[PDB]
């Protein structure tokens, strides 16, 4: 007759129950506003006769809470020509020291980042949590590094003229907790809803090169409108589809430092949620537009590599 005291699972709570007997029920909850339950409709257990808690979809076994993607808790108010930034603003936002650079956390395995940053890199070291950069709040392990295949390698990387298909994944040891200060982006889809559109606003962060300092100690974030390519063409490089440009505003652009962070972007669906449309890649000088990796044209890739890699 008795059920016996639930189980915990992670990221989410079971109230106490009055009873742990024949009858009695409990409810799973998750985490919120940082994890919400996969499936699982309901988180509601009866006690059943047979001694287990059971849920009509799951039966005896427990709910899962996954990351809520694309919510910062306290929007961005008001890099170059960039102000300061919180990182429960961009709560996203990785900080890699080697190189000096950013990324973009997209679940709780899984960081995005530009290959320019991980091509020297099979062990990045990377953090999350912190407005403030640090070296060796919280240090992310890496587990393997994934290079787009169509990132050309080079014996010789500084002086690089081809970033196409400037796209990293980076697999973690451990989960990443969920929290106020670190909750993943979340991924364009691959309907034309996700085709960006010239003028287009989104918003980019990093610690890279300031107008005032070589780079940002604190975040920094600007709003960039997307321009046509041909806007950064004109100011040997190689140019693709699978490049945004963005930027000729107010002189607000991405610097150096800045590469791998994303260029968040409100989903046209949930205007509540950001996005990330693009990645710091490269660019003519710093103040007047940047390249950024089109993500929605590797949408397809990023699902496989985390498949394939569970
Ligand atoms: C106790 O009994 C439950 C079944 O619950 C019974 O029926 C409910 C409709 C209510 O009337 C309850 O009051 C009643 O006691 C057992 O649950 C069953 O567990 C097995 C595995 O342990 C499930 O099989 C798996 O299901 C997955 C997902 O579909 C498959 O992929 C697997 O291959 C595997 O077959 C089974 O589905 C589940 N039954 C239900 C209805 O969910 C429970 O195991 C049992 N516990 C003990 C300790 O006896
Ligand atoms: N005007 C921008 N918005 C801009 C300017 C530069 C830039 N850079 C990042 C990539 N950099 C690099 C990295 C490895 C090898 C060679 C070059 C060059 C600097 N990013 C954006």
Redesign the pocket.
């Known amino acids: 007759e008795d059920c016996g005291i639930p189980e915990s699972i992670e990221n989410g709570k079971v109230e106490d129950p009055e009873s742990t007997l024949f009858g009695s029920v409990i409810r799973y909850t998750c985490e919120e506003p940082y994890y919400y339950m996969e499936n699982g409709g309901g988180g509601e257990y009866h006690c059943a006769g047979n001694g287990s808690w059971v849920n009509e979809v799951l039966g005896p076994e427990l709910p899962k809470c996954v990351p809520v993607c694309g919510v910062p808790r306290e929007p961005f108010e008001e890099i170059i020509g960039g102000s300061d930034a919180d990182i429960k603003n961009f709560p996203w936002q990785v900080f890699f020291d080697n190189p000096w650079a950013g990324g973009a956390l997209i679940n709780e395995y899984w960081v995005l980042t530009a290959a320019?940053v991980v091509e020297g890199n099979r062990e990045p070291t990377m953090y999350v949590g912190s407005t403030s950069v640090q070296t060796s709040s919280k240090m992310l392990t890496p587990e393997h590094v994934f290079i787009h295949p169509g990132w050309k390698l080079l014996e010789v990387?500084?002086?690089?003229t081809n970033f196409d298909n400037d796209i990293a994944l980076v697999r973690l040891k451990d989960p990443v907790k969920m929290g106020p200060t670190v909750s993943p982006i979340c991924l364009p889809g691959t309907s034309s809803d996700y085709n960006l559109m010239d003028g287009d606003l989104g918003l980019i962060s990093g610690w890279g090169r300031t107008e005032k300092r070589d780079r940002a100690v604190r975040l920094k974030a600007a709003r960039l409108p997307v321009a046509p390519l041909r806007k950064c063409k004109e100011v040997a490089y190689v140019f693709t589809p699978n490049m945004i440009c963005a930027?000729g505003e107010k002189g607000m652009?991405?610097?150096?430092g800045?590469?791998g962070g994303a260029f968040a972007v409100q989903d046209p669906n949930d205007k509540t949620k950001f996005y990330a449309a693009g990645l710091?890649?490269?660019?003519?000088?710093?103040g007047?537009?940047?390249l950024y990796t089109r993500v929605k044209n590797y949408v397809d890739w990023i699902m496989k590599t985390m498949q394939e890699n569970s």
């Open positions: 320019h990387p500084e002086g690089r930027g652009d991405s610097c150096k800045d590469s710091v890649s490269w660019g003519p000088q710093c007047t537009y940047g």
